[PDB]
Amino acid sequence: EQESVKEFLAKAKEDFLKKWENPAQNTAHLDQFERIKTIGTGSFGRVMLVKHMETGNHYAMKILDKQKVVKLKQIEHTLNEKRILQAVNFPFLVKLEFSFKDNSNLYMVMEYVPGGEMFSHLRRIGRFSEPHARFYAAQIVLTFEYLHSLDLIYRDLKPENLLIDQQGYIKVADFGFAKRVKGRTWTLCGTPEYLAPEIILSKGYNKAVDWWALGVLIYEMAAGYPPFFADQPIQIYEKIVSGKVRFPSHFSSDLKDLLRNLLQVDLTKRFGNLKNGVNDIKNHKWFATTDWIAIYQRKVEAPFIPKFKGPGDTSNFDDYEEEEIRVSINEKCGKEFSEF
């Protein structure tokens, strides 16, 4: 079993490396897409539903203002985002279909994933049952196994970054702080409720912070709220570094035991970071019902299938204030974003 894993991932590395050292580049242009509706927003620009006209397929195109990226000192991060994303391939990683730039903008046309954000479903329903959250957790366990094995750290796991597709399965969108590193890294980043303690204490950290972020996700999915919360960030970091977590009463004993081993402050005793590796999570009593190969294969019945009134339907996403894409007649930031 764990030698299929070894072999699967070895082949995946042959694949991921070819694309890593020679990235796809300028495989489309703006005016080949019909811009329909803003379906989400981040700090860098908007995400829109678009239809590719020659083929009729719908995608989500993420626009990033080059100048806003610079001001935000996210230039190396945004080259990381695209290079990493064009190069990976896994069922639970949102697909980067096309990418290109103009005078004003960076563009990242991805798989349109019509089911909505884990986030807004989690907040609507309140909280997931353990079986339900396990289904999702399993998909994040296998994805991180895939990512970590290619020397990637994801670094921004949250419900906001997980998109449910038609079959109720998951897609890790947003790769804005993912990073290929062997050894330690120091950038202060992620989202406050999910930061590992070593990230807060400016210590220098590794892939184990994704594993801790796995714990927060699962807790948040099963409790309805995160393990450490407050109104300001600085009070969240107090509660994180303090090394105490109260569990809801309805939490099963096995689930509390996974979380105690995931949201472990001490790196030498934290699941994912030990010598057995990712399997101290896969073979854990909480995932005893979980058939990892069937999860990979898409064979299991999702516990929730999003609503789908047809192609180009945006009802599982919010509405947002529309704004024109403007392309300056002069090139901005060409030296900096050259390799995009």
Partner: peptide, 20 residues
């Protein structure tokens, strides 16, 4: 309850990442 404290907090919407 812990839930009530949370839905009454200011961090129930989409959460931004930090920059440094």
């Amino acid at each position: 309850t812990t839930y009530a404290d949370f839905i009454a907090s200011g961090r129930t919407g989409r959460r931004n990442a930090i920059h440094d």
